[PDB]
Each structure stands twice: as structure tokens, then as C-alpha cells.
Symmetry: C3
Subunit: 154 residues, 3 copies
Amino acid sequence: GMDDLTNLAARLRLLEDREEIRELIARYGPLADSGDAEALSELWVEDGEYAVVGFATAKGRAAIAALIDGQTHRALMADGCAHFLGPATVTVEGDTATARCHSVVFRCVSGTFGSHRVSANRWTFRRTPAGWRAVRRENALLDGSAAARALLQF
Amino acid sequence: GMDDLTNLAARLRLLEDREEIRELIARYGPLADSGDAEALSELWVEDGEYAVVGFATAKGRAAIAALIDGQTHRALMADGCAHFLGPATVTVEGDTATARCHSVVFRCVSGTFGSHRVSANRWTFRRTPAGWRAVRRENALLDGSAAARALLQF
Amino acid sequence: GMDDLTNLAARLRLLEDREEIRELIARYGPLADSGDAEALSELWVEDGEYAVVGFATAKGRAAIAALIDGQTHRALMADGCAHFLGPATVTVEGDTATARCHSVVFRCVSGTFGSHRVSANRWTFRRTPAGWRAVRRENALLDGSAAARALLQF
């Protein structure tokens, strides 16, 4: 029955699921920008992937952590950077979910700030015994590329 | 009584309302950037409006879809663009609601990214039998214009 | 018992807490950009603080309001500005909470838009009888400074 105890519990769980998924996505940028490679990698399942058009795919937590520990990212941190992910649209289906959002990498160059990359992202998630975790993130530049538009599309 | 079943149901409904409204707003940019004109227009009620200072107002779903199908927007998509809407403040009052947020249109020009427009937005919504839908969106540039500040104000 | 009435009430309260805290943060930028100094200051407890590296700390609501009423901020509003705060990560612990987010100040200069400041923020909150309120906000530029990275870190 609508508004009975079992119904409220199901509806609350759905809100909790969505809020957990949004929290994962909102933690990415702070963790990246502070260099917390291990914790960032732990947003994903152990064999999670992070794919970017024109890059080698990072497969598994060690590889994802190695992106944050890597030269290029560390140099970006030394310049000054923000990995700014916007509000996500989220769809939950049982024990899986999908989100889409934009991301901008802001970079400080010569004492002024600019937009180093502007991208689309599509994320997938699954419910694990320890909570929701990312399964795959795909990212592409919104530079006219076809892939970026496809990542956003429903 | 606080925390009784009826009270929990009312409080849960309010959270659901706010999350639905935030989800509408978060879907706008992905739908715009992927060119999904029909679905974007369906964020609004049938006779919904989208007003921008110094532009003709788009009235009705066909007119709102025609903005995304239009030359100017399609050219922006070919350049590479992100319609980046920030987190919204939301106020629900019964079966209506209001939200305010910022939006930035990022555009790729000559292989680098910039901020093509930076704007205020005020959105109104109503509860329909099929869920929350937008009624009116108003937008103005944060270029010193009076209208943009008024859109944000409480 | 999981999913009993008392358990649902506790879980709902936690969602409400997080949504209230997110709403405080989402109101900051609209209030700043519209010049609503009083209401902006009332996001904080009476003796709340707003600290920015290399600035005098604003202590108390009058001082926080005086930032928005101040010359520098008013000139920024006349140029055209957006105080764009991204999605926050939020952790609630009882009657206190912490959030981290990015902020970008967009500014219109000579009819085009740019990123005037890009910053890290760490916010603390407490539950008051009138709802959640900010206690301290700290902000630093993501220009390579150590403080900005520390604000983001978990």
C-alpha cells in the first residue's frame, strides 16, 4: 500500500542509493586535487575502469591510483588545478546505476585561471556489500567530438 | 506525531520532490549537449516557457525543442559546448516549486575552452500527474545586468 | 530492527540533514551575487567565521555581511560575477558536519567572461534549534598553494 512501512522503506532506500552515488561523484574531484590516489581508486570496484578517448584505459584500482600518482597529474597539482564535476543525472535500476555529468579541469597558468579541459562523463555503478561503487567511468572532450555527445545522451 | 508513519511519509515526499526537481535541472545540460530536443522540451509542461533577456521567448514544447534543433545551437554543438548548470537552491510550496542556479556555457574555440556565457537562472515547477515538470525558466547574463541579479534574489 | 519505524525515522533524518547542508551551500552564491548581505550572513551561526588565505578573517554575522556590502564585492557585482560553488561532499557526525567543494568566481571583463578565482573550500556546520548553520568556511586558491589542497583532503 502506498505510504505503508514497507513502501516507505523502499522509497527511502532509493533516495539513499541516489545520494550515495552523488556522494561518490562529488568526492572524485577533492580526492584528485589533494592527491589522495588510494582513496580515489577506492571509489571503484577492484577491477573498475576509467576510460578517456585517446588514452590507455586504467583497469583496476592500482592503475586508477597510478593516474593520480603520475607525473602529468602531479604537475597539474603543482600548477594549481580543480577537477570540477557538475551535478549529475542519476538513474538507479536495482543493484546498478548510471550517471552523466560534465567535468571541467581548471588550471592556473601564469597566475590566471582557465579551462584546461571541458568534458562529458558517463559513469556506471553497482551496489556492493560495502556500498555503491563505480564500475566504469568514460570521459571525452566537448570539443566537437562525437564521443562526448554520446556519453551524455539518454 | 513527529516520527509517526504519516509524518515520515510527508517528510519523505518532500525529499522526493526536491530530488525530482534537482534531477530535471541536472538533465537539461546533457540533453542540450547531445541534441535531444524532444526530451529536453519534455522537461517542461506542454505550454512551458523559456525566456532569456533580449531573446524571443520560447513558448510551448515545440518552440523549446526548436531552440535545440536550431542553427545557432547546432553550430555550438559542432564547436563543442557544455551547458553546465550548477547546484540549485530549491523551495517547494505544495504542488509548486522555485529553483535558482547559475549556468555557464563552455565553448571550444580554436582548440581551447572558454566561458561563452555566464548566467543566472530562475526556474518554476509544478507537480503534474506524471511528475514534476518545469513551467518557466528565465535566464540573464551575469554581465552587470540588473535582471540577472534579480533572478537570483530571494 | 532494519526498516522498522524508528530506523526509518533515523535514516530519513540523516537524508534531511544532508539535504539541508547542501541547500545552505547552494544558497551562498545566489545570495552573494544578488547582494543579499544579511541573508548570506544568516547562513552562519552568529559568531561564524569566513577565512580566506591572505585575508582578514570575517568573524560574526556583521563582518560576513560587510564582505557583501563592501566596495570590492559591489564592484565585482557591477562588472558581472557568478560565485559558482560546485557539488559538495558532506559528512554528518551527530550534530556537526563537514563539507568540501570547489568554487569559481566568474567575472565579466570587457564583454567576455573568465575565471577570476578558482578555489577549494572546507565548511563546517552545526545543528541549531533553527536548523543547520555554517560555523566556519575556509577558502584558498587552487594556484599551487598548499592550503587549497589541504582543504580538500579527507
